[PDB]
Swiss-Prot record, chains A, B:
Range of the intact protein held here: 761 to 815 of 861
The organism's taxonomic lineage, starting at the top: Eukaryota, Metazoa, Chordata, Craniata, Vertebrata
Organism: Rattus norvegicus
Subunit structure of this chain's protein: The vault ribonucleoprotein particle is a huge (400 A x 670 A) cage structure of 12.9 MDa. It consists of a dimer of half-vaults, with each half-vault comprising 39 identical major vault protein (MVP) chains, PARP4 and one or more vault RNAs (vRNAs). Interacts with TEP1. Interacts with PTEN and activated MAPK1. The phosphorylated protein interacts with the SH2 domains of PTPN11 and SRC. Interacts with APEX1. May interact with ZNF540.
Identification of the protein by name: Major vault protein
Locations listed in the record: Cytoplasm; Nucleus
Superkingdom of the source species: Eukaryota
Protein purpose: Required for normal vault structure. Vaults are multi-subunit structures that may act as scaffolds for proteins involved in signal transduction. Vaults may also play a role in nucleo-cytoplasmic transport. Down-regulates IFNG-mediated STAT1 signaling and subsequent activation of JAK. Down-regulates SRC activity and signaling through MAP kinases.
Maturation and modification: Phosphorylated on Tyr residues after EGF stimulation.
Notes concerning its domains: MVP 3 mediates interaction with PTEN.
Length: 55, 55
């Protein structure tokens, strides 16, 4: 018992935790690409100029 | 008893703790690559300029 319940637990636990990391990959891919489109068409120097304003 | 319950505990304990470190590897790979895409297209000198603003 303590072997075969707890080992099917290991195998399903794999099937679910490569799952949560897959969720993390995909959501962070969307965050990534949509910051990239954000900054690249906002302006490479525009972000510098807007943050360097300290007069 | 105290041998064969506690040694199947060792073997499953392996199967689960190389597991938690595998979870750590994969989640930290996504964190890694998506900071890399972050900084490299944000700008190598942009991060310096935005942090060096102290006027």
């Amino acid at each position: 018992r303590v072997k075969k319940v707890r080992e099917m637990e290991l195998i399903y636990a794999r099937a679910q935790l490569e799952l949560e990391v897959s969720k993390a990959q995909q959501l962070a891919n969307v965050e990534a690409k949509k910051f990239k489109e954000m900054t690249e068409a906002l302006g490479p120097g525009t972000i510098r100029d807007l943050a360097v304003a300290g007069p």
